[PDB]
Amino acid sequence: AIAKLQSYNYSHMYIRNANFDVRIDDNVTPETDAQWVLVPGLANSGEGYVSIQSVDHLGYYLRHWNYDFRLEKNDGTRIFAEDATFKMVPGLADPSYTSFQSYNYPTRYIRHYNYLLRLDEIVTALDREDATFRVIDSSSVDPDKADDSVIVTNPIVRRRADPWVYRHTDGYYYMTASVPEYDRIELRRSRTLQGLSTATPKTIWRRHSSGIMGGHIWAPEIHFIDGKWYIYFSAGTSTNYFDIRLYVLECSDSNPLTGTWVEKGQLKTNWESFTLDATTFEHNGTRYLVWAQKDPKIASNSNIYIAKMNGPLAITGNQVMISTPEYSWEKIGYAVNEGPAVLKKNGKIFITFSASATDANYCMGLLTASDTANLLDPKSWHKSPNPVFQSNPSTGQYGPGHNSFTTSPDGKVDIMVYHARNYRDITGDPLYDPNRHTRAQIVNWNADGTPDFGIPVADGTNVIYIPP
Ligand SMILES: OC[C@@H]1O[C@@H](O)[C@H](O)[C@H]1O
Ligand SMILES: OC[C@@H]1O[C@@H](O)[C@H](O)[C@H]1O
Ligand SMILES: [Mg+2]
């Protein structure tokens, strides 16, 4: 069967053939360089054992030689067959994934190192992750196949935080997220939320090697505005990774996974300071920017602001603070409001935000305005006094937040996409614990028309929506 072999720790990268060089790469072009045929093993066709055949050079297989990997044509020798036969076993870093144990060296596994493929003994946790792969084959969810039922297995996407999911008018969801290295902007698409798991992501932009846009790269969001694609994202500098401002990329091409992305520069606000997590929405003919920013006069890391926009590339007028940390549940670790996300429903405009540190104490609050009010008047916005989404020990989910909102494909139900960890205790600076995973669940509605987010669902299969 035809398969891609995706790295466990670099999930944007795939085992591929590069003119007979065997490596892992992202943005594999042509895509067939990353496609393999898993066949019954040359040295043993029986249970477990496979051989990994090139789709372009049939009769050529991956074989180890002096513990390095080569793509070579089967020469009919027993040594070749043994060097090209591997038992598929449960993944060494995660038994739900796959590892490839050598037929003739059964203590050695296929692993990547400096992006090249080797056959090594596996000792460290690094080794285990380097030797674990996700097999994407014909039984995997096809991201190009439409389906009105929303059934996901959470986590949908491992090790992606701040998930942004945008349902476009072409019948695809588009997803951007923070990557654990905070060093690039990643895009994927799927007609179903579950297909986001198996979709091939593309690195559409990498940070500069010095200076501006050269520090932390955080929380990109892709939007379609006035016929063009925009990515709003936050970036520090190479000399201060945390001197973060808003930046914009633009793509006029219709497919953002194949089109050309252009830097447009900084999206400036009323003053220069720590600024991040921008989103935008339209209502009654006006477009707004909603974002997080430090005010030097307020002892919080950031507050929530709204402003009218003047096209996709600027705000106009004065920015208005509509949330600042006030309750103790906004100030665990440090005082912060960030990650705004907009949901329109029932004659209201809802803005969730995240608060407290990005460890298990992370949680969400809610702002509510009437959709006929002046959205630039702070008195139009009401903050809920308690968190509206938070850790839940009984479901094993910790620090949920920086969410986005989307819908089922038929638009009839609202779905929240957010990150959380499936353990509580973090060693070290939580910013560098990479295990916030992307997941989704239904948004329920109270009789009074306000959202009920419930509690973060436990890992596993979640039936979000079946149409009537
Ligand atoms: O790659 C390890 C061994 O080195 C080579 O000599 C053999 O073909 C292979 O089995
Ligand atoms: O191959 C990519 C990385 O390079 C080496 O640093 C590591 O072993 C591996 O994770
Ligand atoms: Mg966001």
Side-chain angles (χ1 to χ4, degrees), residues 265-289:
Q266 187 184 343
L267 209 184
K268 303 252 196 176
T269 68
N270 289 170
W271 64 87
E272 292 303 316
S273 70
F274 183 78
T275 311
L276 71 169
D277 295 352
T279 196
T280 177
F281 71 107
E282 181 275 349
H283 187 66
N284 295 347
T286 298
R287 178 168 295 280
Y288 299 88
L289 190 77

PDB file of all heavy atoms in Angstrom, residues 265-289:
ATOM      1  N   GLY A 265       5.003  43.818   6.430  1.00  0.00           N
ATOM      2  CA  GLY A 265       5.560  44.620   7.502  1.00  0.00           C
ATOM      3  C   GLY A 265       4.689  44.615   8.743  1.00  0.00           C
ATOM      4  O   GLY A 265       3.754  43.825   8.899  1.00  0.00           O
ATOM      5  N   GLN A 266       5.009  45.549   9.635  1.00  0.00           N
ATOM      6  CA  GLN A 266       4.384  45.607  10.946  1.00  0.00           C
ATOM      7  C   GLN A 266       2.980  46.194  10.847  1.00  0.00           C
ATOM      8  O   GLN A 266       2.743  47.161  10.122  1.00  0.00           O
ATOM      9  CB  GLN A 266       5.234  46.443  11.911  1.00  0.00           C
ATOM     10  CG  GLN A 266       4.734  46.400  13.358  1.00  0.00           C
ATOM     11  CD  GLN A 266       5.523  47.310  14.290  1.00  0.00           C
ATOM     12  OE1 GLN A 266       6.633  47.749  13.972  1.00  0.00           O
ATOM     13  NE2 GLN A 266       4.945  47.597  15.452  1.00  0.00           N
ATOM     14  N   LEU A 267       2.046  45.590  11.572  1.00  0.00           N
ATOM     15  CA  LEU A 267       0.703  46.151  11.729  1.00  0.00           C
ATOM     16  C   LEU A 267       0.783  47.014  12.975  1.00  0.00           C
ATOM     17  O   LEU A 267       0.837  46.498  14.097  1.00  0.00           O
ATOM     18  CB  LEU A 267      -0.348  45.052  11.869  1.00  0.00           C
ATOM     19  CG  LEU A 267      -1.793  45.271  11.410  1.00  0.00           C
ATOM     20  CD1 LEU A 267      -2.656  44.046  11.750  1.00  0.00           C
ATOM     21  CD2 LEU A 267      -2.372  46.527  12.027  1.00  0.00           C
ATOM     22  N   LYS A 268       0.830  48.324  12.779  1.00  0.00           N
ATOM     23  CA  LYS A 268       1.110  49.235  13.881  1.00  0.00           C
ATOM     24  C   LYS A 268      -0.168  49.555  14.638  1.00  0.00           C
ATOM     25  O   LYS A 268      -1.244  49.635  14.043  1.00  0.00           O
ATOM     26  CB  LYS A 268       1.743  50.517  13.350  1.00  0.00           C
ATOM     27  CG  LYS A 268       3.013  50.262  12.551  1.00  0.00           C
ATOM     28  CD  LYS A 268       4.239  50.697  13.316  1.00  0.00           C
ATOM     29  CE  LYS A 268       5.445  50.825  12.398  1.00  0.00           C
ATOM     30  NZ  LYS A 268       6.624  51.349  13.139  1.00  0.00           N
ATOM     31  N   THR A 269      -0.050  49.702  15.962  1.00  0.00           N
ATOM     32  CA  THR A 269      -1.138  50.171  16.805  1.00  0.00           C
ATOM     33  C   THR A 269      -0.774  51.539  17.397  1.00  0.00           C
ATOM     34  O   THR A 269       0.158  52.208  16.937  1.00  0.00           O
ATOM     35  CB  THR A 269      -1.470  49.120  17.873  1.00  0.00           C
ATOM     36  OG1 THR A 269      -0.391  48.993  18.805  1.00  0.00           O
ATOM     37  CG2 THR A 269      -1.707  47.771  17.215  1.00  0.00           C
ATOM     38  N   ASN A 270      -1.530  51.977  18.411  1.00  0.00           N
ATOM     39  CA  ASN A 270      -1.386  53.363  18.867  1.00  0.00           C
ATOM     40  C   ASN A 270      -0.062  53.629  19.575  1.00  0.00           C
ATOM     41  O   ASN A 270       0.306  54.796  19.727  1.00  0.00           O
ATOM     42  CB  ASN A 270      -2.508  53.776  19.827  1.00  0.00           C
ATOM     43  CG  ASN A 270      -3.865  53.949  19.155  1.00  0.00           C
ATOM     44  OD1 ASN A 270      -4.873  54.100  19.845  1.00  0.00           O
ATOM     45  ND2 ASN A 270      -3.906  53.913  17.825  1.00  0.00           N
ATOM     46  N   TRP A 271       0.639  52.600  20.055  1.00  0.00           N
ATOM     47  CA  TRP A 271       1.944  52.812  20.679  1.00  0.00           C
ATOM     48  C   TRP A 271       2.774  51.544  20.525  1.00  0.00           C
ATOM     49  O   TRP A 271       2.240  50.471  20.246  1.00  0.00           O
ATOM     50  CB  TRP A 271       1.814  53.223  22.154  1.00  0.00           C
ATOM     51  CG  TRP A 271       1.205  52.192  23.063  1.00  0.00           C
ATOM     52  CD1 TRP A 271       1.859  51.191  23.716  1.00  0.00           C
ATOM     53  CD2 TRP A 271      -0.177  52.082  23.440  1.00  0.00           C
ATOM     54  NE1 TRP A 271       0.975  50.460  24.471  1.00  0.00           N
ATOM     55  CE2 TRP A 271      -0.284  50.984  24.316  1.00  0.00           C
ATOM     56  CE3 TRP A 271      -1.330  52.803  23.118  1.00  0.00           C
ATOM     57  CZ2 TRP A 271      -1.496  50.582  24.864  1.00  0.00           C
ATOM     58  CZ3 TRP A 271      -2.536  52.412  23.678  1.00  0.00           C
ATOM     59  CH2 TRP A 271      -2.610  51.311  24.541  1.00  0.00           C
ATOM     60  N   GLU A 272       4.092  51.688  20.669  1.00  0.00           N
ATOM     61  CA  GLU A 272       5.030  50.577  20.512  1.00  0.00           C
ATOM     62  C   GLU A 272       5.244  49.887  21.855  1.00  0.00           C
ATOM     63  O   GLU A 272       5.731  50.505  22.805  1.00  0.00           O
ATOM     64  CB  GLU A 272       6.379  51.045  19.966  1.00  0.00           C
ATOM     65  CG  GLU A 272       6.373  51.547  18.542  1.00  0.00           C
ATOM     66  CD  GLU A 272       5.848  50.530  17.562  1.00  0.00           C
ATOM     67  OE1 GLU A 272       6.230  49.343  17.656  1.00  0.00           O
ATOM     68  OE2 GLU A 272       5.046  50.926  16.689  1.00  0.00           O
ATOM     69  N   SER A 273       4.915  48.602  21.915  1.00  0.00           N
ATOM     70  CA  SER A 273       5.081  47.782  23.110  1.00  0.00           C
ATOM     71  C   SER A 273       4.831  46.343  22.690  1.00  0.00           C
ATOM     72  O   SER A 273       4.486  46.074  21.536  1.00  0.00           O
ATOM     73  CB  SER A 273       4.120  48.203  24.235  1.00  0.00           C
ATOM     74  OG  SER A 273       2.779  47.864  23.892  1.00  0.00           O
ATOM     75  N   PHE A 274       5.036  45.421  23.640  1.00  0.00           N
ATOM     76  CA  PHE A 274       4.688  44.007  23.505  1.00  0.00           C
ATOM     77  C   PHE A 274       3.266  43.865  22.962  1.00  0.00           C
ATOM     78  O   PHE A 274       2.315  44.265  23.636  1.00  0.00           O
ATOM     79  CB  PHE A 274       4.847  43.342  24.880  1.00  0.00           C
ATOM     80  CG  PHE A 274       4.592  41.861  24.910  1.00  0.00           C
ATOM     81  CD1 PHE A 274       5.545  40.953  24.454  1.00  0.00           C
ATOM     82  CD2 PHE A 274       3.425  41.368  25.473  1.00  0.00           C
ATOM     83  CE1 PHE A 274       5.303  39.577  24.527  1.00  0.00           C
ATOM     84  CE2 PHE A 274       3.187  40.008  25.543  1.00  0.00           C
ATOM     85  CZ  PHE A 274       4.124  39.115  25.066  1.00  0.00           C
ATOM     86  N   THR A 275       3.110  43.328  21.745  1.00  0.00           N
ATOM     87  CA  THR A 275       1.811  43.238  21.070  1.00  0.00           C
ATOM     88  C   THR A 275       1.709  41.889  20.372  1.00  0.00           C
ATOM     89  O   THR A 275       2.630  41.517  19.640  1.00  0.00           O
ATOM     90  CB  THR A 275       1.643  44.362  20.032  1.00  0.00           C
ATOM     91  OG1 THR A 275       1.982  45.630  20.610  1.00  0.00           O
ATOM     92  CG2 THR A 275       0.201  44.437  19.529  1.00  0.00           C
ATOM     93  N   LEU A 276       0.590  41.176  20.552  1.00  0.00           N
ATOM     94  CA  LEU A 276       0.513  39.806  20.051  1.00  0.00           C
ATOM     95  C   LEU A 276      -0.938  39.371  19.849  1.00  0.00           C
ATOM     96  O   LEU A 276      -1.882  40.053  20.254  1.00  0.00           O
ATOM     97  CB  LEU A 276       1.217  38.817  21.000  1.00  0.00           C
ATOM     98  CG  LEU A 276       0.575  38.508  22.364  1.00  0.00           C
ATOM     99  CD1 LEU A 276       1.254  37.329  23.059  1.00  0.00           C
ATOM    100  CD2 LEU A 276       0.565  39.721  23.301  1.00  0.00           C
ATOM    101  N   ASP A 277      -1.089  38.202  19.216  1.00  0.00           N
ATOM    102  CA  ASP A 277      -2.346  37.436  19.206  1.00  0.00           C
ATOM    103  C   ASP A 277      -3.494  38.202  18.545  1.00  0.00           C
ATOM    104  O   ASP A 277      -4.631  38.169  19.029  1.00  0.00           O
ATOM    105  CB  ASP A 277      -2.771  37.010  20.621  1.00  0.00           C
ATOM    106  CG  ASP A 277      -1.805  36.020  21.295  1.00  0.00           C
ATOM    107  OD1 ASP A 277      -0.851  35.502  20.660  1.00  0.00           O
ATOM    108  OD2 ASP A 277      -2.012  35.762  22.507  1.00  0.00           O
ATOM    109  N   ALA A 278      -3.217  38.883  17.432  1.00  0.00           N
ATOM    110  CA  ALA A 278      -4.268  39.638  16.757  1.00  0.00           C
ATOM    111  C   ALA A 278      -5.232  38.711  16.024  1.00  0.00           C
ATOM    112  O   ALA A 278      -4.839  37.681  15.462  1.00  0.00           O
ATOM    113  CB  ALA A 278      -3.675  40.642  15.760  1.00  0.00           C
ATOM    114  N   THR A 279      -6.508  39.083  16.039  1.00  0.00           N
ATOM    115  CA  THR A 279      -7.518  38.458  15.201  1.00  0.00           C
ATOM    116  C   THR A 279      -8.362  39.564  14.575  1.00  0.00           C
ATOM    117  O   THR A 279      -8.223  40.743  14.906  1.00  0.00           O
ATOM    118  CB  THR A 279      -8.379  37.461  15.994  1.00  0.00           C
ATOM    119  OG1 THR A 279      -9.086  36.610  15.074  1.00  0.00           O
ATOM    120  CG2 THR A 279      -9.372  38.189  16.922  1.00  0.00           C
ATOM    121  N   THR A 280      -9.228  39.191  13.634  1.00  0.00           N
ATOM    122  CA  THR A 280     -10.104  40.178  13.028  1.00  0.00           C
ATOM    123  C   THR A 280     -11.463  39.558  12.729  1.00  0.00           C
ATOM    124  O   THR A 280     -11.594  38.342  12.552  1.00  0.00           O
ATOM    125  CB  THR A 280      -9.469  40.770  11.760  1.00  0.00           C
ATOM    126  OG1 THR A 280     -10.390  41.684  11.141  1.00  0.00           O
ATOM    127  CG2 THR A 280      -9.082  39.673  10.769  1.00  0.00           C
ATOM    128  N   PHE A 281     -12.483  40.411  12.719  1.00  0.00           N
ATOM    129  CA  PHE A 281     -13.832  40.009  12.348  1.00  0.00           C
ATOM    130  C   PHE A 281     -14.524  41.198  11.698  1.00  0.00           C
ATOM    131  O   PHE A 281     -14.096  42.347  11.839  1.00  0.00           O
ATOM    132  CB  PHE A 281     -14.643  39.503  13.552  1.00  0.00           C
ATOM    133  CG  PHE A 281     -15.034  40.585  14.534  1.00  0.00           C
ATOM    134  CD1 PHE A 281     -16.354  41.035  14.609  1.00  0.00           C
ATOM    135  CD2 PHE A 281     -14.099  41.137  15.386  1.00  0.00           C
ATOM    136  CE1 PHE A 281     -16.717  42.018  15.514  1.00  0.00           C
ATOM    137  CE2 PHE A 281     -14.450  42.120  16.288  1.00  0.00           C
ATOM    138  CZ  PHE A 281     -15.764  42.571  16.355  1.00  0.00           C
ATOM    139  N   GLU A 282     -15.602  40.900  10.976  1.00  0.00           N
ATOM    140  CA  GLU A 282     -16.434  41.904  10.329  1.00  0.00           C
ATOM    141  C   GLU A 282     -17.825  41.863  10.946  1.00  0.00           C
ATOM    142  O   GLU A 282     -18.319  40.802  11.340  1.00  0.00           O
ATOM    143  CB  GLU A 282     -16.525  41.660   8.803  1.00  0.00           C
ATOM    144  CG  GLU A 282     -17.359  42.674   8.005  1.00  0.00           C
ATOM    145  CD  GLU A 282     -18.864  42.363   7.991  1.00  0.00           C
ATOM    146  OE1 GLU A 282     -19.267  41.260   8.423  1.00  0.00           O
ATOM    147  OE2 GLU A 282     -19.650  43.231   7.544  1.00  0.00           O
ATOM    148  N   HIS A 283     -18.458  43.026  11.020  1.00  0.00           N
ATOM    149  CA  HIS A 283     -19.835  43.094  11.487  1.00  0.00           C
ATOM    150  C   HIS A 283     -20.503  44.333  10.908  1.00  0.00           C
ATOM    151  O   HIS A 283     -19.990  45.446  11.061  1.00  0.00           O
ATOM    152  CB  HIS A 283     -19.898  43.115  13.016  1.00  0.00           C
ATOM    153  CG  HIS A 283     -21.288  43.016  13.555  1.00  0.00           C
ATOM    154  ND1 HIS A 283     -22.062  41.886  13.408  1.00  0.00           N
ATOM    155  CD2 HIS A 283     -22.050  43.911  14.226  1.00  0.00           C
ATOM    156  CE1 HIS A 283     -23.241  42.087  13.969  1.00  0.00           C
ATOM    157  NE2 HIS A 283     -23.259  43.307  14.473  1.00  0.00           N
ATOM    158  N   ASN A 284     -21.636  44.130  10.234  1.00  0.00           N
ATOM    159  CA  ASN A 284     -22.446  45.228   9.714  1.00  0.00           C
ATOM    160  C   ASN A 284     -21.618  46.222   8.898  1.00  0.00           C
ATOM    161  O   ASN A 284     -21.780  47.439   9.011  1.00  0.00           O
ATOM    162  CB  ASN A 284     -23.183  45.926  10.852  1.00  0.00           C
ATOM    163  CG  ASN A 284     -24.192  45.017  11.509  1.00  0.00           C
ATOM    164  OD1 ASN A 284     -24.511  43.956  10.971  1.00  0.00           O
ATOM    165  ND2 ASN A 284     -24.701  45.420  12.673  1.00  0.00           N
ATOM    166  N   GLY A 285     -20.721  45.696   8.064  1.00  0.00           N
ATOM    167  CA  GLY A 285     -19.933  46.512   7.163  1.00  0.00           C
ATOM    168  C   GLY A 285     -18.658  47.107   7.732  1.00  0.00           C
ATOM    169  O   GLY A 285     -17.936  47.785   6.992  1.00  0.00           O
ATOM    170  N   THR A 286     -18.353  46.890   9.010  1.00  0.00           N
ATOM    171  CA  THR A 286     -17.113  47.379   9.606  1.00  0.00           C
ATOM    172  C   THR A 286     -16.226  46.204   9.995  1.00  0.00           C
ATOM    173  O   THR A 286     -16.706  45.210  10.547  1.00  0.00           O
ATOM    174  CB  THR A 286     -17.396  48.256  10.834  1.00  0.00           C
ATOM    175  OG1 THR A 286     -18.156  49.404  10.432  1.00  0.00           O
ATOM    176  CG2 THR A 286     -16.093  48.727  11.507  1.00  0.00           C
ATOM    177  N   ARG A 287     -14.936  46.313   9.692  1.00  0.00           N
ATOM    178  CA  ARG A 287     -13.959  45.326  10.126  1.00  0.00           C
ATOM    179  C   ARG A 287     -13.199  45.857  11.337  1.00  0.00           C
ATOM    180  O   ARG A 287     -12.887  47.052  11.424  1.00  0.00           O
ATOM    181  CB  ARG A 287     -12.980  44.953   8.997  1.00  0.00           C
ATOM    182  CG  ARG A 287     -11.889  43.929   9.427  1.00  0.00           C
ATOM    183  CD  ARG A 287     -11.128  43.364   8.236  1.00  0.00           C
ATOM    184  NE  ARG A 287     -12.002  42.576   7.366  1.00  0.00           N
ATOM    185  CZ  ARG A 287     -12.359  41.320   7.613  1.00  0.00           C
ATOM    186  NH1 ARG A 287     -11.920  40.701   8.712  1.00  0.00           N
ATOM    187  NH2 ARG A 287     -13.148  40.676   6.758  1.00  0.00           N
ATOM    188  N   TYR A 288     -12.926  44.956  12.279  1.00  0.00           N
ATOM    189  CA  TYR A 288     -12.264  45.261  13.534  1.00  0.00           C
ATOM    190  C   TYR A 288     -11.012  44.411  13.662  1.00  0.00           C
ATOM    191  O   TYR A 288     -10.958  43.287  13.156  1.00  0.00           O
ATOM    192  CB  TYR A 288     -13.181  44.979  14.718  1.00  0.00           C
ATOM    193  CG  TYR A 288     -14.445  45.807  14.711  1.00  0.00           C
ATOM    194  CD1 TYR A 288     -15.581  45.366  14.039  1.00  0.00           C
ATOM    195  CD2 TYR A 288     -14.494  47.036  15.360  1.00  0.00           C
ATOM    196  CE1 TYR A 288     -16.742  46.124  14.028  1.00  0.00           C
ATOM    197  CE2 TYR A 288     -15.658  47.800  15.351  1.00  0.00           C
ATOM    198  CZ  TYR A 288     -16.766  47.343  14.676  1.00  0.00           C
ATOM    199  OH  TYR A 288     -17.912  48.103  14.667  1.00  0.00           O
ATOM    200  N   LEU A 289     -10.006  44.958  14.332  1.00  0.00           N
ATOM    201  CA  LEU A 289      -8.893  44.160  14.838  1.00  0.00           C
ATOM    202  C   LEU A 289      -9.055  44.012  16.348  1.00  0.00           C
ATOM    203  O   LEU A 289      -9.414  44.972  17.033  1.00  0.00           O
ATOM    204  CB  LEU A 289      -7.537  44.808  14.510  1.00  0.00           C
ATOM    205  CG  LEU A 289      -6.275  43.964  14.764  1.00  0.00           C
ATOM    206  CD1 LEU A 289      -6.069  42.922  13.670  1.00  0.00           C
ATOM    207  CD2 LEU A 289      -5.061  44.865  14.865  1.00  0.00           C
TER     208      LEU A 289
END
